[PDB]
Design a binder for these strands. Structure first.
Ligand code: MG
Ligand code: MG
Ligand code: MG
Ligand code: MG
Ligand code: MG
Ligand code: MG
Ligand code: MG
Ligand code: MG
Ligand code: MG
Ligand code: MG
Ligand code: MG
Ligand code: MG
Ligand code: MG
Ligand code: MG
Ligand code: MG
Ligand code: MG
Ligand code: MG
Ligand code: MG
Ligand code: MG
Ligand code: MG
Ligand code: MG
Ligand code: MG
Ligand code: MG
Ligand code: MG
Ligand code: MG
Ligand code: MG
Ligand code: MG
Ligand code: MG
Ligand code: MG
Ligand code: MG
Ligand code: MG
Ligand code: MG
Ligand code: MG
Ligand code: MG
Ligand code: MG
Ligand code: MG
Ligand code: MG
Ligand code: MG
Lengths: 159, 127, 185, 222, 58, 51, 172
RNA sequence: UGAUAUGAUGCCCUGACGAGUAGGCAGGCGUGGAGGUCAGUGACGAAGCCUAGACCGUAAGGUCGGGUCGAACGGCCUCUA
RNA sequence: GCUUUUAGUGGGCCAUUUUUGGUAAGCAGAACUGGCGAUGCGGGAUGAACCGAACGUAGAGUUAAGGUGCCGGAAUACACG
């Protein structure tokens, strides 16, 4: 009959990254987490303790607790037509600080600067982001570059 | 003599008769709506009878008006009849079916006096 | 056709008139839809709606609950408005003076109000003294202190109070309510 | 009370000022438009003179028509069609072209026809089938006060102020464009020109971006 | 008499009628599941600063 | 009560857009354009007629 | 596909920082309108060079009219096409008064004789044959003889009325 | 809500929308009996029945004429099965 | 945005794409979507599921998919083979 046990289906998911097996480098343990931090969940197959269930692989969430070897992470998992709050106890080997907010934090700090520098000159800011715009007109020169004329080519084989 | 109205449009003048009321005597013409699972009528298959729906409802302006333009109002006696005294361009009296012949001559008489229209004056007339 | 993004012919879901058949109530509404239409004062809109409320959505306001609201610093001289009935609270020993506009006052509640030298005003009387609802304090009763609400949301680990007729031990206290028998909730 | 001709004069006189402002504005736009067109014409000529090639700025504005009926549509395009406010057949709206819209158009290509509208067809779209959304309620335009009332805070006190905001894709294009109810077009009076519609334009069909050929279509549907 | 075994067919039409309601974020989320030693100290910590701000309005 | 098309009704055409009067008057829709004779470079014509 | 026009289409890869002014390629395309023509360009361009519309730019589009539209020409024509069971190169000769008219009947011919639709054909070359007796296929050579004259036997006049009172004559 | 005229659940302006089994709800039609009312109808003809005659209603149904008939019966506000 | 309460249902079937068993099946079993079931209307002669298009009562216009020798509304139309 069917087999649904805890780690079922996880063969390549928890696999180790080619020529990356062995001890986990020490920086993983030197990193520091605080409540509110945003972390990414990726299981480390070499660490059997404190392991995320496969559903939370590739999932990002927030730290609600900090403990000796571990951090608690809340995740919104959707079951049915709704989301429920999930609380995960994970060891620090399966967690990584997320860069998902990095550009935003960067963009804020840069925005404050441009805004002060603007006020201190005068007004004229425009700090909202804008989508790719269509190109403006342009003039392309034929000097040194005269159009080469191409035709489609006949059927061949070379086997 | 009737209050002026827009042209009266009836919009479906044909009677809505029960499906198969024409097929079996046991089925009256009175409208009744098909609940059947397979029924072609309930499913509106092209070629069948049409069913009542609110779209057919008459214009609020001319609704209830008769050909003459008056709304008809049932009348038992003179007192009833006199409730139309101030509206003769709106309502017409229809004399109740059970009013006696001799009484009908009195209602008609007062009707004339008041200029109130009567829809069935020839009823029970001794002639 | 239209690919409809929203359900068609949907009633707003809000009361329009009260469901009540009482003339006097229907007159007060007559008063306040007028007031709400012409005064631009937000108070009148809030009152007009409240009159539509069914008995459950208008819990009584205690006379002691009133007394507490005038202890807000700055509010002592405002006239409290209760759209609903006012009930007496035996367990306050000193009631301020003030003024209360209500739909109903219980015998003992208006007595207490009146014995401190206060006033009991009907909402139409309040209307004439304060067409814009000036200097008014609106009080609402505790809706969810009702008994039925205890049983709402019943389920495993919800802490929510079973619908039950008899109580005491050996009524729905054993398997599922304690670690010893089966499991617990 | 006076008010007889008294506040009728204070009104009529003020009405005359607004028409005046509108005259010199529409007079300006006309100058703007034709010297913009002349300038591109001469750009192209001067480039050939230089032995070069003048390439135009890619279009910043397109006009989409829903070409497909309401049933049997996959959910993803279906949402997009809603977000672009095309919920029934032959109804159409204006779209500003950026990466984050152009990708939307991509998703709905099989169900719509679109291209680059000329000043001419924008003008006749609005004068005839142009309506505003005012407390919903789809109000016909028909008088300039209706616009000034609702779009006034952005500038835009006339019907041609509107048109100008659309075609130039102005700073206030979002508010201008959303103000206009989706246009309700009839079927084309010529017909579709193709034997079957639900092929792409390039394949002999009606859908996707037919570019400047959108004007011939819409004008026959308007 | 065998019959259908299982399907997800139509299940997401249903889910989407009233649904897929976003998580409903709150300011001040619950402390549930937080380390007890921390919470114990946090408790006294708050009591002290509470007393402190009442000493400001003394 | 009944919508009137500016493009068919000169009354309301002039109601919206007062510029319509001078547009029609200065004739404006048929405007002639300045005549210039600038000519295309040999490179342009050569590559046009190229193979 | 339609009544054809011939377009010059010129395009290039988008300018990079380290490669501004990329190399400018041209194709001559037969299409009914500029929308199809630009499409076809990118079609063959992606078959040759590393580009696609998204990373490229159309520099110029231009229609090329016949130099001598009233002069009769013998066109040699070169084509690649797909059959049901394989793909093949052909050479046909067409005689007409403009390139654009020639490509019209080519496409008709490929449809009629080899059952090739428009998608399945590549025009390899179209070029005027300058000296007669470089003319190869004889369904053309036939028409190059001196003092050429032929009749049109058995002529059918189209009737405008359903009935006729005469009986007809095919004389010409 | 402004009286001095007649519906405030009313009256007036405006916009959008209309498929439907199982099923929910709403507003209405019709019947036997009950409280109230119109000092209701009737032996100078109640009720009933007949009638490719008439009229009102989208409809359930309502109203009239004519024929037959012979002792009782109906409108409205409410109650009830 | 939020709360309560309750019906029916808990035999399903089909189409494009992915796809398992089977020589195969108008066979048996999954995936995503769209459909039929509950749904008429135009087209495919005919037909649950295809194409087009989703329905209040109507007037005028224009179209879709599909057609225009005659049955049958609409060129015994034009053009190259
Ligand atoms: Mg297994
Ligand atoms: Mg262990
Ligand atoms: Mg039945
Ligand atoms: Mg049937
Ligand atoms: Mg059935
Ligand atoms: Mg209690
Ligand atoms: Mg024991
Ligand atoms: Mg838009
Ligand atoms: Mg026509
Ligand atoms: Mg024509
Ligand atoms: Mg066809
Ligand atoms: Mg038109
Ligand atoms: Mg079984
Ligand atoms: Mg079976
Ligand atoms: Mg089953
Ligand atoms: Mg089983
Ligand atoms: Mg319905
Ligand atoms: Mg009704
Ligand atoms: Mg009843
Ligand atoms: Mg009864
Ligand atoms: Mg009748
Ligand atoms: Mg009658
Ligand atoms: Mg009789
Ligand atoms: Mg009788
Ligand atoms: Mg007897
Ligand atoms: Mg009753
Ligand atoms: Mg339920
Ligand atoms: Mg049940
Ligand atoms: Mg249930
Ligand atoms: Mg059940
Ligand atoms: Mg399908
Ligand atoms: Mg099967
Ligand atoms: Mg069934
Ligand atoms: Mg269905
Ligand atoms: Mg259907
Ligand atoms: Mg399809
Ligand atoms: Mg036949
Ligand atoms: Mg015919």
């Amino acid at each position: 009959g069917k087999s649904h046990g805890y780690r079922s289906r996880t063969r390549y998911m928890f696999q180790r990254d080619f020529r990356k097996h062995g001890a986990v480098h020490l920086s993983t343990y030197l990193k520091v987490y605080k409540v509110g931090d945003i972390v990414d969940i990726k299981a480390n197959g070499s660490i059997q303790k404190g392991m995320p269930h496969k559903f939370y692989q590739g999932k990002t969430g927030v730290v609600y607790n900090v403990t000796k070897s571990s951090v608690g992470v809340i995740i919104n998992k959707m079951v049915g037509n709704r989301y429920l709050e999930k609380r995960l106890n994970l060891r620090v080997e399966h967690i990584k600080h997320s860069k998902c907010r990095q550009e935003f934090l960067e963009r804020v700090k840069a925005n404050a600067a441009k805004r002060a520098e603007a006020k201190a000159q005068g007004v004229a800011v425009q700090l909202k982001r804008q989508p790719a715009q269509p190109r403006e007109s342009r003039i392309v020169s034929t000097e040194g570059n005269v159009p080469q004329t191409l035709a489609p080519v006949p059927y061949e084989t070379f086997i | 003599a009737s209050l002026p109205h827009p042209k009266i449009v009836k919009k479906h003048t044909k009677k809505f008769k029960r499906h198969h009321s024409d097929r079996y005597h046991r089925v009256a013409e009175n409208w009744r709506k098909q609940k059947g699972i397979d029924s072609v009528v309930r499913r509106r298959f092209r070629g069948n009878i049409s069913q009542p729906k609110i779209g057919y409802g008459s214009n609020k302006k001319t609704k209830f008006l008769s050909p003459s333009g008056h709304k008809t109002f049932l009348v038992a006696n003179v007192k009833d009849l006199e409730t139309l005294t101030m509206h003769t361009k709106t309502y017409a009296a229809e004399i109740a079916h059970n009013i006696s012949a001799k009484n009908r001559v009195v209602i008609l008489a007062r009707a004339k006096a008041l200029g109130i229209k009567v829809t069935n004056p020839k009823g029970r007339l001794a002639l | 056709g239209i690919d409809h993004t929203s359900k068609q012919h949907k009633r707003s879901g809000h009361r329009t008139a009260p469901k009540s058949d009482n003339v006097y109530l229907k007159l007060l509404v007559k008063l306040y839809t007028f007031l709400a239409r012409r005064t631009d004062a937000p108070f009148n809109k809030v009152v007009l709606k409240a009159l539509f409320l069914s008995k459950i959505n208008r819990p009584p306001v205690s006379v002691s609950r009133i007394a507490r609201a005038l202890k807000q610093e700055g509010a002592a001289n405002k006239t409290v408005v209760v759209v609903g009935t006012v009930t007496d609270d035996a367990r306050i020993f000193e009631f301020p003076k003030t003024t209360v506009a209500a739909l109903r006052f219980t015998a003992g509640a208006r007595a207490k109000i009146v014995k401190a030298g206060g006033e009991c005003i009907t909402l139409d009387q309040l209307a004439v003294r304060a067409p814009k609802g000036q200097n008014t304090l609106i009080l609402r009763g505790p809706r969810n202190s009702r008994e039925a609400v205890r049983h709402f949301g019943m389920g495993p680990h919800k802490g929510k109070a079973p619908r039950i007729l008899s109580t005491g031990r050996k009524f729905e206290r054993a398997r599922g309510r304690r670690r010893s028998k089966g499991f617990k909730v | 009370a006076e008010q007889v001709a008294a506040e009728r004069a204070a009104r009529k006189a003020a009405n005359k000022e607004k028409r005046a402002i509108i005259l010199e504005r529409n007079a300006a736009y006309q100058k703007e438009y034709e010297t913009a067109e002349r300038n591109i014409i001469q750009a192209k000529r001067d480039a050939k003179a230089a032995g070069s090639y003048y390439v135009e700025a890619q279009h910043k504005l397109v006009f989409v028509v829903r070409i497909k009926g309401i049933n049997k549509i996959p959910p993803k395009p279906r949402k997009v069609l809603q977000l672009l406010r095309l919920t029934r057949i032959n109804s159409g709206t204006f779209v500003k072209v950026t990466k984050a819209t152009l990708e939307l158009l991509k998703l709905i290509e099989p169900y719509v026809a679109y291209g680059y509208p000329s000043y001419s067809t924008i003008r006749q779209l609005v004068y005839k089938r142009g309506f505003g959304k005012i407390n919903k309620q789809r109000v016909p335009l028909s008088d300039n006060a209706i616009i000034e009332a609702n779009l006034g805070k952005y500038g835009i006190l006339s019907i041609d102020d509107l048109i100008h905001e659309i075609i130039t894709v102005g700073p206030h294009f979002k508010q201008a464009n959303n103000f206009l109810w989706p246009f309700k077009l009839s079927n084309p009076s010529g017909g579709w020109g193709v034997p079957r519609k639900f092929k792409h334009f390039i394949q002999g069909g009606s859908f996707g971006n037919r570019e400047e050929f959108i004007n011939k279509l819409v004008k026959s549907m308007n | 008499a065998k019959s259908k075994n299982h399907t997800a067919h139509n299940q997401t039409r249903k889910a989407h009628r009233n649904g897929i309601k976003k998580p409903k974020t709150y300011k001040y989320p619950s402390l549930k599941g937080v380390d007890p030693k921390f919470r114990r100290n946090h408790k006294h910590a708050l009591h002290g600063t509470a007393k402190a701000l009442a000493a400001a309005k003394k | 009560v009944l919508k009137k098309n500016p493009l068919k009704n000169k009354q309301v055409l002039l109601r919206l857009n007062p510029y319509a009067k001078v547009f029609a008057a200065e004739k404006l829709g048929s405007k002639k354009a300045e005549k210039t004779g600038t000519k295309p470079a040999a490179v342009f014509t050569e590559t046009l007629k190229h193979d | 596909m339609a009544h054809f026009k011939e377009y010059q289409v010129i395009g290039r890869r988008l300018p990079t920082e380290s490669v501004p002014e990329p190399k400018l390629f041209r194709m001559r395309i037969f299409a009914s309108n500029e929308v199809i023509a630009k499409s076809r360009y990118w079609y063959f361009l992606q078959k040759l060079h590393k580009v696609k519309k998204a990373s490229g730019e159309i520099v110029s589009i231009n229609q090329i009219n016949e130099a001598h539209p009233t002069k009769v020409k013998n066109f040699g024509v070169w084509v690649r096409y797909d059959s049901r069971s394989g793909t093949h190169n052909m050479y046909k000769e067409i005689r007409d008064v403009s390139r654009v008219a020639a490509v019209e009947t080519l496409y008709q011919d490929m449809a009629a004789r080899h059952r090739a639709r428009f998608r399945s054909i590549h025009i390899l070359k179209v070029a005027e044959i300058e000296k007669t007796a470089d003319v190869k296929r004889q369904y053309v050579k036939q028409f190059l003889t001196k003092d050429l004259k032929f009749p049109l036997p058995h002529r059918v006049q189209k009737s405008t009325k359903t009935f006729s009172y005469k009986r007809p004559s095919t004389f010409y």
